[PDB]
Design a protein around this nucleic acid. Structure first.
Ligand SMILES: Nc1nc2c(ncn2[C@H]2C[C@H](O)[C@@H](COP(=O)(O)NP(=O)(O)OP(=O)(O)O)O2)c(=O)[nH]1
Ligand SMILES: [Mn+2]
Ligand SMILES: [Mn+2]
Length: 430
DNA sequence: ATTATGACGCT
DNA sequence: AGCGTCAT
């Protein structure tokens, strides 16, 4: 009872940009705004592969991973923007730069963890304590939460979406105890006020809209974020967890969408996250290992301890290209030329990184995939990265992979290569 | 013939 | 160190 810690110590938010690459292209080209739109890489094969989709186009069934020609079948008026091509490959620099714009705004409010190109976790615990001090026990007006949903409300005792949103918000605000500066629900509420301000700042200063989740830990904040997209934020309280999880498929929780989540379902004979509460911690550890078992035991009760890491910059800088089917590389000249193309993009990105961020990579990882191997990487080898020089990096990558070529002929490469990947790692301050 | 990345756990 | 998983 009283000693049962409830995972309510922290206020954590997850901010994710809506259809991010689409918004970057719509900012640049106003003709694409408020239209069914998607972003594609390449063009020749089936119109290019879609990687981002506006919500207008999603209404027609267009999704990521779709070929643009098939998307056009679902939505003939779909508008398309193509990713830049440089040195024969997709080049994502425009989106990385746009991402920096958003991350620097977020960093004004709190220290952030860059989780991907378009999402960051925010630990708001201290900022909430400060705003609470300033409030002096003043209640929180619904005007301060104009885009916030309270998950699970309204309950009990209407037809429009905004009306439902406001009804639930009113129930939540009416039940708040604002004289208690340590009430977790009040703390989450103040956290949501701050996130409204953060999202307003991002949109004012970049033009980009985003969604957000506010809860007591990273997993719940990320799930909350997905509940009301686009351009809205969602508060998931500790108390909302039993009902939310009672019908939540296990695969919806971050890290359970793959083989481990499938094993949870199959071994335990369950479907929903809340069913996990009926097992002891030792039972879960027996099936899924000590770490996963402890994590699952806490997570199905809404509890997770993973910290928001103070990290705004990526830990690695990499360049990769697939060479599918008949485009697979089968000569030494080919392999060398593409290693050079990748290495030249890498050099450019690394030099700009060193100038911006006062650090230098020290290790080069070379990964290849060979024809007939279904794995992502067939082989990974590291070497030293001592100079930011594309010719040296590509020569070193060749040296560490060249023993793969099973061809007796010097000129031929067998079996042919269907992927090259160069990744700079192990950064040191410079 | 999804593709291009990135984080992180295991041994 | 090199490989596998999860993500998207
Ligand atoms: N190169 C590449 N980029 C990708 C891929 N998948 C996503 N991206 C890029 C394009 C995406 O815009 C961006 C962010 O990924 P999300 O948050 O997963 N999707 P979004 O922000 O579009 O929609 P939502 O409103 O539902 O969050 O990453 C991929 O497979 N390859
Ligand atoms: Mn997004
Ligand atoms: Mn994202």
């Amino acid at each position: 009872g009283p000693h049962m810690a409830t995972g309510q110590d922290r206020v954590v938010a997850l901010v994710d940009m809506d259809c991010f690459f689409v918004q970057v292209e719509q900012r640049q080209n106003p003709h694409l705004r408020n239209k069914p739109c998607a972003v594609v890489q390449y063009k020749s094969w089936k119109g290019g592969g879609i990687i981002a989709v506006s919500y207008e186009a999603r209404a027609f069934g267009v999704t990521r991973s779709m070929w643009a020609d098939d998307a056009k079948k679902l939505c003939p008026d779909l508008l398309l923007a193509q990713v830049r091509e440089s040195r024969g490959k997709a080049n994502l620099t425009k989106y990385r730069e746009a991402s920096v714009e958003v991350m620097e705004i977020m960093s004004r409010f709190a220290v952030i963890e860059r989780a991907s190109i378009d999402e960051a976790y925010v630990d708001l615990t201290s900022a909430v304590q400060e705003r609470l001090q300033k409030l002096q026990g003043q209640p929180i007006s619904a005007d301060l939460l104009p885009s916030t949903y309270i998950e699970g409300l309204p309950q009990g005792p209407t037809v429009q979406k905004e009306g439902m949103r406001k009804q639930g918000l009113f129930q939540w605000l009416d039940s708040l105890q604002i004289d208690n500066l340590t009430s977790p629900d009040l703390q989450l509420t103040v956290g949501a006020v701050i996130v409204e301000e953060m999202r307003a700042a991002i949109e004012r200063e970049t033009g980009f809209q985003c969604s957000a989740g506010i809860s007591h830990n990273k997993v719940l904040a990320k799930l909350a974020c997905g509940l009301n997209k686009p351009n809205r934020q969602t508060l998931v309280s500790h108390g909302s967890v039993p009902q939310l999880f009672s019908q939540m498929p296990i695969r919806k929780i971050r890290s359970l969408g793959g083989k481990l989540g499938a094993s949870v379902i199959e071994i335990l004979g369950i479907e929903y996250m809340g069913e996990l509460t009926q097992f002891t911690e030792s039972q879960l550890q027996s099936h899924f290992g000590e770490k996963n078992g402890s994590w699952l035991y806490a997570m199905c009760r809404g509890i997770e301890h993973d910290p928001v890491k103070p990290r705004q910059l990526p830990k690695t800088i990499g360049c990769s290209k697939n060479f599918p089917g008949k485009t697979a590389l089968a000569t030494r000249e080919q392999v060398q030329w593409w290693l050079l193309q990748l290495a030249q993009e890498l050099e450019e990105r690394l030099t700009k990184d060193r100038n911006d961020n006062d650090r230098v990579a020290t290790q080069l990882v070379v990964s290849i995939r060979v024809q007939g191997d279904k794995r992502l990487s067939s082989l990974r080898r590291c070497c030293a990265l001592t100079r930011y020089d594309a010719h040296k990096m590509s020569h070193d990558a060749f040296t560490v992979i060249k023993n793969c070529n099973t061809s007796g002929i010097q000129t031929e490469w067998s079996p042919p290569l269907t992927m090259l990947f160069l990744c700079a790692t192990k950064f040191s301050a410079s």
